[PDB]
Design an enzyme around this catalytic site. Structure first.
Site, mmCIF file in Angstrom:
data_model
loop_
_atom_site.group_PDB
_atom_site.id
_atom_site.type_symbol
_atom_site.label_atom_id
_atom_site.label_comp_id
_atom_site.label_asym_id
_atom_site.label_seq_id
_atom_site.Cartn_x
_atom_site.Cartn_y
_atom_site.Cartn_z
ATOM 1 N N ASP A 118 59.866 67.278 6.259
ATOM 2 C CA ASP A 118 59.149 66.070 6.659
ATOM 3 C C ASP A 118 58.369 66.221 7.952
ATOM 4 O O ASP A 118 58.070 65.229 8.598
ATOM 5 C CB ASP A 118 60.094 64.877 6.788
ATOM 6 C CG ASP A 118 60.484 64.307 5.461
ATOM 7 O OD1 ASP A 118 59.783 64.580 4.468
ATOM 8 O OD2 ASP A 118 61.493 63.578 5.405
ATOM 9 N N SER A 119 58.050 67.426 8.381
ATOM 10 C CA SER A 119 56.990 67.537 9.358
ATOM 11 C C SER A 119 55.720 67.824 8.576
ATOM 12 O O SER A 119 55.703 67.748 7.349
ATOM 13 C CB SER A 119 57.299 68.610 10.394
ATOM 14 O OG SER A 119 57.334 69.886 9.805
#
Ligand code: MG
Ligand code: ZN
Ligand code: ZN
Ligand code: ZN
Ligand code: ZN
Lengths: 56, 231, 49, 159, 65, 84, 147, 45, 56, 56
Positions: G4-5
């Site tokens: 989730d970056s």
């Protein structure tokens, strides 16, 4: 912080910008994923303590 | 007995303290040798009076600053000898009118007289003694816009009236016969300059000035029409 | 060099969010103490620990 | 600046406006020149005056920049107009009393420092239009040949 | 607001294209797919600039300074 | 309609923009017709008509029928600087 | 870009992708207690003023405000406000020597910076002069930023 | 004295201290602070 | 509960965490700002004296 | 316990007053004085006491 794993020593590498950087193997014990999550850091002030962290 | 703490640099000692204080580090440091001086810097009658006074100023819609100036005033007078009376109605109105003055707001003796029945002359004496006490403890113009409000007049009318009041006071001639008559007449002139009808009786009623008074002021004011013209 | 795999690729609509790292990061060593408990104050704006 | 646009918002758009770099070779870098701030050796000075005249909306164009600094007769700094109508980049709009007057200092640089120096738009790179080298295996559903488009450059190589 | 200059990917200058774009749409009634083409926006990195753009500077100008 | 009482006592209409800027409350005044009577016992004397009495101020929701904006048009709104 | 970056184009950022303005609004007001003590907007003089903040006051105009367009940074003081002090009331530290006025000035946030967009002065309901200040800053997408 | 601007008519005032706060020629009590004259610098980055 | 068994403390830093592949398992990147803020009180001795002197 | 605990002591014949450090004052705007609720309670217990004294 519900694991004893959830608080662990670390060895500082100073790098630029803003976020704390850390490898992703360690994302699981913290139950951590990188979106808006934050992590408190704590510096020991005494040589004794500094040793304990590295050794325990 | 002593108990006053002063901060001094034992290594400098040259002057008294000349230091800076660091709030973020919450410490205080001598600006010279850069030594830390300190650490861990931490971050019955009356009430009745002020109650009824509160009610009065409230009904009068006066801003809290005025209310509180009057409160302060009244506390100073309080129980003192020289007042010697007045039954608590005179003092509340006096202190109010004071706080109005001191607040640069203006209210007419008649207006307050509409909130409270003070009998008049008795009021003047009380007001003067209170004034004397305040000195011991050591301006019509404002009225002009307020009146326009009552008539709902345009801005230009108001400022015209202001120029008119200053010009009239300088030209003297009757000295004003109290400011109220001059403020109302000044208006009446200014409005009659413009086309906007209030006629006369409506302003005499509305603003509580005798119609004969407005016309009488108007004749003398008319005579000096020459020099009162702003543009 | 070509990638042995092909990438699913195209426009999409994105929203930036209030949260911004600059508003978050803070680090305290020897700040001010609360008057009551003389323990470090709370909050970033107050520079708490 | 009386404009509705925030000031640095403007200075951003100005940063993006292409300029004539033909001779840029002989304009030295900022840090190279020994003067304080800038000069005619390390920089080119541009300025813009925009005062909204008409009742209708006035438009500030890239062409409205004007070069006040001595160029030593070298070809640099002219804001480039590739439009057919001869106007160019639209910097800001103005209504009536809104006025904009500012000075820009143009300096030499490269893209890695900031993308506003990038000379090249997209660069199409391709090789081996047929898959002969097998650097890429094709995702497909039934057949890869039918689905995957025939690249145009395929025409210049053998089947 | 007001016509992003250049382009968020390819870097081609998209600013000046805006006026002529509105010209084509108002005058020639041509649909966007034709307009952008005639303007010479080949890639769709550019195209999304013009097409998706929302111009608020107009609705800003109508306030008196 | 929505109004403001300034400190000096000048009273004037309030348009919401300024209302925000000045830390005001956007409200209109309320008046009531008070008829007073006296009896002596159903005998009736009394004073009536002539009163219209101010009870207090009522906050006013924007765009409602009472506020000044509800009747405004587009450019009208622009003069008052409230985005349509 | 794991977990989730995401990776973002730096050129794209540089060209204006996802750049946003941020307007902070500081508001301050001068007040009176018993009408005996009045707070005042004024540019404080380091000589006679006490408890003074250590941010630089150079930017203030005489009235005690920062004229807009001035680039400001954290710890700078936007609004110079002062209060009177009774000499006998405290006499703490140097207050007897300073004689006069305790410093109350609202600083800009410690960590912020930017350009003052707009400053307006206005009397409120009850007549107190007070001022608002509006500081705009460009916040460019950064490594820590979220989407 | 210091220069200000009216809220609505945008007239230049430059009222002094102890003038309280009001516009001359209209009643608006909102006064803008009339942007600084001296130069301000940006980097287009 | 609030002020004894646990408490708000100094020498601590908080920020967003984000991942990096190029760091060894145990490390953490700490941004220069935080580094320049937090501090460790080391003790002078013959060994470090030169290094410390440089720091000062 | 005969030494430390007596029912007599459970009943209150007299009362301790904490120093201000337990019940400090705080300042609002730093120009206005703020008082602690414990201080207000001491003021009440006092006033009530004085009253009961006089009436008695
Ligand atoms: Mg998360
Ligand atoms: Zn010293
Ligand atoms: Zn040079
Ligand atoms: Zn493109
Ligand atoms: Zn005006």
């Amino acid at each position: 912080s519900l694991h004893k794993m959830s608080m662990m020593a670390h060895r500082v590498k100073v790098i630029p910008y803003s976020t704390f950087r850390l490898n992703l193997s360690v994302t699981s014990p913290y139950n951590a994923d990188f979106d808006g999550d934050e992590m408190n850091l704590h510096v020991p002030q005494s040589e004794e303590t500094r040793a304990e962290l590295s050794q325990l | 007995p002593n108990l006053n703490i002063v901060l001094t640099c034992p290594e400098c000692k040259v002057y008294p303290p000349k230091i800076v204080e660091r709030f973020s580090e919450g410490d205080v440091v001598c600006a010279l040798c850069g030594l830390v001086l300190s650490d861990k810097l931490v971050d019955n009658e009356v009430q009745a009076a002020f109650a009824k006074i509160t009610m009065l100023c409230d009904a009068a819609e006066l801003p809290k600053i005025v209310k509180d100036c009057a409160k302060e005033a009244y506390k100073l007078c309080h129980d003192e000898k020289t007042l010697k009376g007045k039954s608590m109605e005179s003092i509340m109105a006096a202190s109010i009118l004071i706080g109005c003055r001191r607040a640069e707001v203006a209210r007419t003796f008649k207006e307050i007289q509409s909130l409270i029945h003070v009998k008049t002359k008795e009021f003047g004496k009380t007001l003067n003694i209170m004034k004397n006490i305040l000195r011991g403890k050591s301006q019509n113009l404002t009225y002009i816009p307020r009146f326009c409000s009552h008539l709902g007049l345009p801005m230009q009318v108001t400022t015209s009236a202001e120029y008119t009041a200053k010009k009239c006071k300088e030209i003297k001639e009757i000295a004003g016969k109290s400011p109220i008559t001059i403020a109302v007449v000044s208006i009446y002139l200014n409005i009659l300059l413009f086309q906007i009808p209030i006629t006369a009786a409506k302003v005499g009623q509305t603003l509580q000035v005798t119609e004969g008074t407005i016309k009488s002021g108007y004749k003398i004011l008319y005579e000096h029409r020459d020099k009162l013209v702003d543009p | 060099k070509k990638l042995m795999a092909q990438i699913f690729f195209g426009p999409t609509y994105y929203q930036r969010l209030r949260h911004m790292v600059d508003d978050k990061i803070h680090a305290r060593a020897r700040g001010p103490m609360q008057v009551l408990t003389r323990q470090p104050v709370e909050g970033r704006s107050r520079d708490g620990g | 600046n009386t404009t509705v646009l925030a000031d640095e918002f403007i200075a951003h758009r100005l940063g993006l406006i292409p300029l004539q770099s033909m001779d840029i070779e002989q304009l030295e870098y900022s840090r190279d020149c020994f003067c304080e701030d800038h000069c005619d050796k390390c920089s080119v000075v541009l300025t813009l005056q925009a005062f909204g005249e008409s009742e209708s909306t006035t438009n500030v164009y890239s062409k409205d920049l004007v070069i006040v600094s001595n160029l030593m007769g070298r070809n640099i700094g002219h804001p480039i107009i590739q439009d057919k109508e001869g106007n160019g980049v639209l910097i800001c709009k103005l209504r009536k009393g809104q006025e904009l007057k500012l000075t820009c200092v143009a300096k030499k640089g490269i893209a890695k420092e900031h993308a506003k120096w990038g000379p090249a738009a997209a660069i199409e790179f391709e090789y081996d239009p047929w898959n002969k080298l097998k650097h890429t295996d094709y995702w497909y559903e039934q057949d890869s040949a039918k689905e995957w488009p025939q690249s145009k450059n395929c025409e210049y190589e053998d089947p | 607001m007001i016509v992003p200059v250049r382009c968020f990917s390819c870097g081609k200058v998209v600013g000046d294209k805006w006026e002529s774009y509105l010209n084509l749409l108002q005058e020639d009634e041509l649909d966007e797919g034709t307009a952008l083409s005639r303007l010479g926006l080949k890639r769709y990195c550019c195209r999304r600039m013009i097409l998706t753009h929302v111009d608020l500077i107009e609705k800003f100008l109508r306030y008196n300074p | 309609k929505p109004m403001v009482n300034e400190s000096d006592g000048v009273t004037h209409a309030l348009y919401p923009q300024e209302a925000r800027l000045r830390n005001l409350t956007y409200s209109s005044g309320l008046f009531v017709d008070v008829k007073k009577r006296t009896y002596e016992l159903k005998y009736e004397l009394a004073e009536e008509s002539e009163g219209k009495v101010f009870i207090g101020r009522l906050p006013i929701m924007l765009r409602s029928k009472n506020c000044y904006l509800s009747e405004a048009t587009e450019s009208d709104l622009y003069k008052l600087k409230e985005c349509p | 870009n794991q977990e989730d970056s995401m990776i973002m184009n730096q050129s794209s950022i540089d060209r204006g992708l996802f750049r946003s303005l941020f307007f902070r609004s500081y508001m301050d007001q001068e007040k009176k207690y018993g009408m005996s003590i009045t707070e005042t907007f004024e540019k404080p003089q380091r000589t006679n003023t006490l408890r003074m903040k250590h941010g630089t006051y150079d930017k203030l105009d005489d009235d005690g405000l920062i004229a807009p367009g001035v680039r400001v940074s954290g710890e700078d003081v936007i609004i110079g406000k002062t209060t009177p002090i009774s000499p006998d009331e405290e006499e703490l530290g140097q207050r007897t020597a300073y004689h006069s006025k305790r410093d109350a000035s609202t600083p800009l946030r410690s960590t912020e910076n930017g350009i003052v967009d707009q400053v307006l002065v206005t009397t409120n309901q009850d007549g107190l002069k007070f001022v608002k200040v509006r500081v705009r800053t460009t916040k460019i997408p950064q490594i820590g930023d979220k989407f | 004295t210091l220069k200000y601007i009216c809220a609505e008519c945008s007239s230049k005032l430059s009222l002094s201290r102890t003038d309280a706060v009001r516009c001359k020629d209209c009643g608006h009590r909102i006064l803008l602070k009339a942007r600084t004259k001296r130069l301000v610098q940006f980097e287009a980055r | 509960r609030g002020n004894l068994m646990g408490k708000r403390v100094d020498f601590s830093a908080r920020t967003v965490i984000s991942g990096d592949p190029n760091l060894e398992l145990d490390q953490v990147g700490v941004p220069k700002s935080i580094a320049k803020t937090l501090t460790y009180p080391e003790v002078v001795t013959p060994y470090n004296i030169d290094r410390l002197t440089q720091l000062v | 316990n005969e030494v430390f605990s007596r029912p007599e002591w459970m009943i209150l014949t007299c009362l301790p007053v904490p120093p201000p450090p337990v019940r400090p004052s705080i300042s609002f705007n730093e120009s206005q004085r703020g008082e602690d609720d414990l201080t207000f309670k001491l003021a009440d217990i006092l006033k009530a006491n004085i009253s009961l004294e006089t009436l008695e």
